[PDB]
Amino acid sequence: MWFEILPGIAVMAACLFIPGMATAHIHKFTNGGKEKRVAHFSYQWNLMERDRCISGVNRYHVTKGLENID
Amino acid sequence: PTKETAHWKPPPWNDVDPPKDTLVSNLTLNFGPQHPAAHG
Amino acid sequence: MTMYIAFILSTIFVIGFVGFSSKPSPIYGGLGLIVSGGVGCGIVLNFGGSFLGLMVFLIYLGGMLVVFGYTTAMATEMYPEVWVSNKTVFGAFVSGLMMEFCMVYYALKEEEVEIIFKFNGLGDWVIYDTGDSGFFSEEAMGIAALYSYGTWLVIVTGWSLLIGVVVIMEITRGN
Amino acid sequence: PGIVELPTLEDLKVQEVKVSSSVLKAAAHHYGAQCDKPNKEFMLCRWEEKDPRRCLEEGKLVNQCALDFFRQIKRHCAEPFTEYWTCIDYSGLQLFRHCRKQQAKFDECVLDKL
Amino acid sequence: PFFDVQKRLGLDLDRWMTIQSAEQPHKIPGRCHAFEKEWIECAHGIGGIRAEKECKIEFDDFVECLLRQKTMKRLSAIKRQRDKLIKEGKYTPPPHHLG
Amino acid sequence: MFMINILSLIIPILLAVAFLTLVERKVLGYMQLRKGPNVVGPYGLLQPIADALKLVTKEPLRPGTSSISMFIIAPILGLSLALTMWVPLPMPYPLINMNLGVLFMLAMSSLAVYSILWSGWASNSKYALIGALRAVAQTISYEVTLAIILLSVLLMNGSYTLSTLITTQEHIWMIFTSWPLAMMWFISTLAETNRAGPFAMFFMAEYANIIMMNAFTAILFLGASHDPHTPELYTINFVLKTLALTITFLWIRASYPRFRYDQLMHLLWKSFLPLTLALCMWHISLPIMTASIPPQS
Amino acid sequence: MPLVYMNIIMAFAIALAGLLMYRSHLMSSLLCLEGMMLSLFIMSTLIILNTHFTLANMMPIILLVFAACEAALGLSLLVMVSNTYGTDYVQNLNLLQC
Amino acid sequence: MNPIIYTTLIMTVMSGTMLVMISSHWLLIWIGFEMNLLAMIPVLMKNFNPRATEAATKYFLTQATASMMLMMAIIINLLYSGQWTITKMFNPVAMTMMTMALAMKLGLSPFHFWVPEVTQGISLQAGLLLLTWQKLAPLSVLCQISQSINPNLMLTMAMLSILIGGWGGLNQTQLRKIMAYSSIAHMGWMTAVLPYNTTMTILNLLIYITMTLAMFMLLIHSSATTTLSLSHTWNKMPVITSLMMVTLLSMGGLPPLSGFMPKWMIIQEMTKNESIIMPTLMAMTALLNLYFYMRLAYSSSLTMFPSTNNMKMKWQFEHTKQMKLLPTMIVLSTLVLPMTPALSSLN
Amino acid sequence: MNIMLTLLTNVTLASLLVLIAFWLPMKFFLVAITFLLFDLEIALLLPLPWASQTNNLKTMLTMALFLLILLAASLAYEWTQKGLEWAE
Amino acid sequence: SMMKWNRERRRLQIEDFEARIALMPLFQAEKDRRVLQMLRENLEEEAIIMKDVPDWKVGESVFHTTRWVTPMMGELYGLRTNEEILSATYGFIWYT
Amino acid sequence: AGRIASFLKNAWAKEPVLVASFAIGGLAIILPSLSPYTNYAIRINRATPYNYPVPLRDDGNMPDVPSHPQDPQGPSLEWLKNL
């Protein structure tokens, strides 16, 4: 009967699965764990620019905390 | 009247200019015999 | 170099304008300005016009540009024209592009072209300002005031568009 | 039609707080309530004096007071802060919603220790 | 307006947005808010033609803010001399110029 | 690095669209007392490739009356705009986190009419132009319903940011709150998708569009949950939901006769539109009536 | 005044000339009309966004909703003219010579 | 046209004109112009003859173009002053563009081309509306920006208008064309005094408007469109042609008829502004208007013309339309000169 | 940067996909205008989600409901005077 | 159910915004020093680059007013490298 | 009575879609007028701060405004925390 559609849809299922999968992980790879900080408004953007300038390595995704001040 | 206006006809009295001739677009269509709905 | 990217958007905007203003086939003239419609949003987008830029694509590009292509698809003059068929349009085509290119070169040479208005050909990024926009998008919060401060335009626009409906049917009614 | 007078580097070289955005937002509420004495003064100066050059002294003082509070909590439960703020950045929009448990692990120290 | 009904009826129909320095949504200030406030307050109850002679430097200040033509010419002069100088082996930008 | 993701957003879709054709035939197979393609590889798995591999090998027979410029440009945009459609989809974290993704999604959906109009006008055939004339009139007709429906449901989200959609649904699927609009949208996406030589690309475009429009409905109404520490759970839930909706597209495509042209517009203007207007009016008053207006930030 | 203002200024100017240089097609001229007001649309946005005139952000939208609205008449007179004469040609747009 | 649909269609046309006169925001002015354009084409389209489609077309393309150019006069002024109010305009070319555009809405320079042509195709009653009600809104803007107008621009435009309007009227035989040509001529008088005190423009507007309602509505009751058709009217309606002739000299402007009311004060005002060649040309070429005025007068009532036998039929029946408000339009058009100082009320 | 890249790759992939596919081997008009006239009115109606978050919601309620009323009235007018009835 | 959840998000927005307005005084102070320090560096270069020009009194007041005016972002970075002007101008508009 | 009953019966028998749309639209037009939560809707909308709370100068005569942000004085939104 119909269980033969599953091989037909499974390929598309896996094929449709990669984009969301790929975006999920390389964002972690590019941004080091945390997601790419979304900037829907000016505030989140200049928050990011302050982070990038304060990192010193010129990378927002690198975060420095209480250890950074003495 | 001048040579330029020696042919300008006066406007129609009812302001309805002579209607244009037959401008119908009765398109002719062939629905087959290749059309599947034509049944071969 | 994306230093002068808005220059690139600005110049290709007008060459698209020269295209249809050269008066080719209406359908080919239509596509000649949808590209200009497409690039114009880019200029607004690069300036921060998210909603206004997307308006060009949605109501301008995806809206009434369709029915004009639709109208040409109705009329269908006994031969649909093309830039190739007319030789005068080619003469105007080259004239517009050359006139733009020379003035651009003059504009980028001494930055003091006084045609109609005196102006500076300096970089497009220069005119921008500083200061954060907070959490509110000024382009979106301003247009949202149409229902708060635009208490008059909605009345006239709503009345006019309804008046737009009656006039359309009445004149197309054919007595 | 005049000279644009602006301050010199001597008054501009001030100690700067060196932390990431998640550090600020994680302790923003507690910092806002306590470290407020210079913040209101500097903010009031900016609206009233309307001259960014005029409020330089208040601008350096609020950072200094923020430095005081930041090292003050370093005397205290920094590790609960450390785990709290290192989980805040994980969110794209940096919401406290996914970190309430870690938040409680942070406030309860300053709740009684301060 | 020709027959200004707003003044008699005391209702606002277009004055709310006719200038950039009036009340704005969420108190968002316009770019040249300070200069418009100065120019408008410079010329009130003074005359349509007295403003073009008295409140001139206020208007010139405001008109400069909105176009910034003179600043644009100023920065162009700065940049023109900059690359006219560095190209001849003259003064080299400090480290903070290039980052 | 970004280039990898863009390819990683296009290649698997193209493979998925390739295998949609096998799905389109075979899920209709046992739903027809049929078996579907089973001779071309195991369970017809090679049929996606086979059809996508033989069509390109055929010569591109273009009539001389057809202008080669438009006859090529119109198919080109028919896919390219349909390929950027997939981009702002809030699959865990979307590619471009546009603050106005809904407008970006719908506006590019408004340019898919140009592929049909030009490829029909350039053909210069009496059958072709009336077909293009029919298709352009239908799609632009359902455009007004598409936007009004979106305005109603999105009003309870907070802003046109597609990334905010997941947060809005969360606990409850938003189909529960706008089911009268849900079937309104599902019929609308069916009509726009045109689904009740240089051709494999067009079929791929009109089939990628089916998956996305189904995916757009999936993210809109048939929501899900997203754990920041395990986005893969949201991935599987999302692809499964849009797969089922694509199956429904196939389910009804083999369950109904066609719509006559007059009823095609009668259903929209005289039935769908006035009901859509009321529902939009309901969906704007209600958040105000209940003080449940979502935050813009 | 930068080039972004200027480039679209002559974009209107060539559009203004285009509508004022009827070749044979009023449809082509009509298509020149809305492109011409698009130059108005973009200038309106450019100035308003540049100066942060917050309340004036409505105006560019409502500029579209009337120019496009009158464009309906522009087609509507055209769609009726093409009936009696059989084409959009402005050469036949001289029946009212007297 | 359904009478209710016609009724509201005029209601918006007046509303659009009203919006122009009662607003200070430049953008609202453009809406008033566009809305008026939006709902007057159907008024021209009432009869739906191919001639009307011709004229209704010609009007739209000129009027739509004028609105667009007017719209940049808004944005360029905004671009160079950051203002939206109707005040002393703050940019030279922006003022030039608006004046060049507002004039086209009225028609003084060769922009006048559409005015006669548009009047010919469209009906007589729709003509009345076009020549008397529209011509208020474009003048409404001008009276408010007159302080900033380049004086040496409309004066050439007004001189060109009065010259061409009078010049062509000699050669016209279709009463609609004569009426429109005279309107162009009188509109030259409108704009000539405009840079100076605008109170005289309003007096010219009011006097001319009432003066052309009388001219048109008598023509409507005659149901005549050609000079010969008006000539035959002596038989059935001998008095109607007589009032037509009384309007004609007031049309021309010979005292004591109040058609000389506008011209007199224009000369008086423009003489106070050390302009004396300018009035002389206007008074001189204004005589050209009187020429074809007499020609139409000679055909109408001053002489008699060969009628037709079938006209005896019309003798038995009486007119049905009640010529609303007409009996005082004629009176307020001719014998108003003695009550001259009322212009002080206008300002 | 990111956006210009995204609108670049897909069009390039489309162009190559046709390269391998090319070198390897009144009433109908009337209903459209009605769409345009309604299309313009939905443009006014789009900014609603941000409009709902204004301080004076009462004025917003009247106008947002007003615009949809004119949507209905325009449709109802066209319907009752044939109009939306497509000529068959 | 949606009305309850939406009220929570409004509360969550309040908590988010209350975090921001506490952060403003420090951010305003930090950006205050940075913008005019960058301006001073601009005029320090201005003296060197405009040493030979006829009467360029370095530090001209653009406007007749004496009150401070926020600088145009054009002559704020200026001399800065290509990438700095790129990230500064179309940074937020292009980041995504 | 009978007139409206027959007419409504007539409408729902021939055009169920139309009456449903009118009922929903007609319903939605009146709830805000007597809505018991719209008063809350403006209150919470006015309680969302987008801009900075600008301090005002302290010279006495204003005991109503608090000194510290945690001070008892000033408006309180316990209703916001509850509804």
Ligand SMILES: CCCCCCCCCCCCCCCCCC(=O)OC[C@H](COP(=O)([O-])OCC[N+](C)(C)C)OC(=O)CCCCCCCCCCCCCCCCC
């Ligand atoms: C307090 C509550 C407030 C809100 C209450 C709202 C009112 C109650 C609900 C109203 C009815 C429901 C909404 C409207 C739906 C029908 C609209 C309509 O026009 O119907 C009549 C129409 C037409 O019915 P007709 O042909 O009998 O004619 C009806 C009347 N005239 C002639 C005027 C049109 O029905 C359809 O169009 C049927 C569907 C046609 C398309 C073919 C595909 C159908 C696929 C169905 C299966 C898949 C469903 C998927 C659902 C979504 C899943 C995610």
Ligand SMILES: CCCCCCCCCCCCCCCCCC(=O)OC[C@H](COP(=O)(O)OCCN)OC(=O)CCCCCCCCCCCCCCCCC
């Ligand atoms: C400024 C200079 C002058 C400008 C105006 C000049 C006008 C005439 C110029 C020549 C015109 C062309 C040539 C003649 C055309 C004649 C037109 C006409 O219709 O003539 C025939 C017509 C027939 O008359 P009929 O219409 O039957 O009416 C008779 C009176 N019931 O005749 C008529 O209809 C004539 C109607 C006459 C009506 C007379 C009314 C008299 C009222 C007297 C009131 C007295 C009050 C006294 C009070 C005292 C106490 C205070």
